[PDB]
């Protein structure tokens, strides 16, 4: 009969289990026998206190490196301000030791945990690539709670080496099953930032994870976008509880906050899932998240039902992760078919945007060809356009099944005149739909100003398969 952890702060880990049903349903996975044994997770951040009394028992030097100083030891740099505490806090959420009289527990409290010290220095493309590409046949899951500036005006993503690291990771990592990259969706809510303007979260190769407050609301720091896949609990207002984890200087904190806490919790749930089925591919894992995540009692004004009956929100993706459901569904999961890619060049001439532009195109999604897609995964609208004030633009994409994805909401602080240069806006909201039929792209000026520009390229890129659909929800 499963015995829950006895750790002194475990009763404060409201998001792991509770009578109330506002939790990630992790105890149900633990009781099925899954606590992370044999799974290796690495935190890409400012280091990891490998001697922390709640991390040492699970620490894995093979999951760790110091890219900033080029040595094997990711110990954080200690300063009076304790600036380099972030990675240690993330690590404890994944894999803090259980039943040891110290602080609380990780989601995957028997997994092995490492850290890559890579933020405490100049974060070049090469630094990112050496981190994402660290020991890819040993590390299973990478967790990153960082990215481009959340000022609400930046459009930035992985440069060449980092993108190569993603492609190498998902292709050859983990024995050819693919490295699992978990990403926090961002803290730019106060700036009205969009997580589709962040190429790390907007990547198909990352599971981008947003946050919900204890009372089920969209936190102040949350960024809305169509690339987000799912949600875990994190912090909110000062009446709402926060995240309990390991802190720098061998301490315990009950006040870890922001989307930085959501990616590690997701990484821990994914670790339990991979223990339940070690043969899952990187795409299998995203399918499991889509099928098992739960909207219930997350509050948002944009919940919509997609073409296969699943509720989806730009604040939450498919909803809260459900660890018990993930490990249950993983056990007898049938590997998905190989990924197909259908490239559709939409325009026959440039189109002036003006106040409003609508582009309609009926597609066959590579009918008659080996890359025919009847079951969508990710879809991208790769757009090249000029505009005099980028943040006045709002962009929507409507699928043949009627699912309206917001690719870009207005960004009041984005005064850029640089437009978008083949930017691959991504949506998860049409997952499992048939992409044959009419797609609609809408570009609108949300301001009263007499703005101007031109759309010169629109590539619709469809990923997916042609077999295996479920009856719609």
């Amino acid at each position: 009969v499963y015995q829950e952890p006895t750790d002194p702060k475990f009763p404060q880990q409201w998001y792991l289990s509770g009578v109330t049903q506002r939790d990630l349903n992790v105890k149900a996975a633990w009781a099925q026998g899954y606590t992370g044994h044999g799974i290796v997770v690495s935190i890409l951040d400012d280091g990891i206190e490998k001697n922390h009394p709640d991390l040492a028992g699970n620490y894995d030097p093979g999951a760790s490196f110091d890219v900033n100083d080029q040595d094997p030891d990711p110990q954080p740099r200690y300063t009076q301000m304790n600036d380099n505490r972030h990675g240690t806090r993330c690590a404890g959420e994944v894999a803090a030791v259980a039943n040891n009289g110290v602080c609380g527990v990780g989601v995957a409290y028997n997994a092995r945990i490492g850290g890559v010290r890579m933020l405490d220095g100049e974060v070049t493309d090469a630094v990112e690539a050496r981190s994402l590409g660290l020991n890819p046949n040993h590390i299973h899951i990478y967790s990153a709670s960082w990215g481009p500036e959340d000022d609400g005006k930046t459009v930035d993503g992985p440069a060449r080496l980092a993108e190569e690291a993603f492609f190498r990771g998902v292709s050859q990592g983990r024995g050819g099953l693919g490295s699992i990259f978990v990403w926090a969706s961002g803290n730019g809510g106060r700036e009205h930032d969009s997580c589709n303007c962040d190429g790390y979260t907007n990547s198909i190769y990352t599971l981008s994870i947003s946050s919900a407050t204890q009372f089920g609301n969209v936190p102040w720091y949350s960024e809305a976008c169509s690339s987000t896949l799912a949600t875990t609990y994190s912090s909110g207002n000062q009446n709402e509880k926060q995240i309990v984890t390991t802190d720098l200087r061998q301490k315990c904190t009950e006040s870890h906050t922001g989307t930085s806490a959501s990616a590690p919790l997701a990484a821990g749930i994914i670790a339990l899932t991979l223990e339940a089925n070690k043969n899952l591919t990187w795409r299998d894992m995203q399918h499991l998240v889509v099928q098992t995540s739960k909207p219930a009692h997350l509050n948002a004004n944009d919940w919509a039902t997609n073409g296969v009956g699943r509720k989806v929100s730009h604040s939450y993706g498919y909803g809260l992760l459900d660890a018990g459901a993930m490990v249950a569904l993983a056990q007898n999961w049938t590997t998905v078919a190989p990924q197909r890619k259908c490239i559709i060049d939409i325009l026959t001439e440039p189109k002036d945007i003006g106040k409003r532009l609508e582009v309609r195109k009926t597609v066959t999604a590579c009918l008659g060809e080996p890359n025919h897609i009847t079951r969508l995964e990710h879809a991208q609208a790769r757009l090249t356009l000029s505009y005099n004030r980028r943040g006045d633009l709002a962009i929507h994409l409507v699928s043949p099944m009627g699912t309206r994805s917001t690719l870009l909401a207005a960004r009041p602080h984005d005064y850029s005149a640089d437009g978008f240069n083949d930017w691959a806006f991504m949506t998860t909201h049409s997952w499992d739909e048939d992409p044959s039929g009419e797609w609609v792209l809408e570009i609108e000026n949300t301001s009263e100003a007499n703005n101007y520009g031109t759309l010169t390229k629109f590539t619709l890129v469809l990923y997916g398969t042609a077999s295996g659909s479920l009856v719609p929800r």
Binding site: H86, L119, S145, W146, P148, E149, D156, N187, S260
Partner: peptide, 5 residues
Amino acid sequence: XRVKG
């Protein structure tokens, strides 16, 4: 850039 989160 790259900011913590």
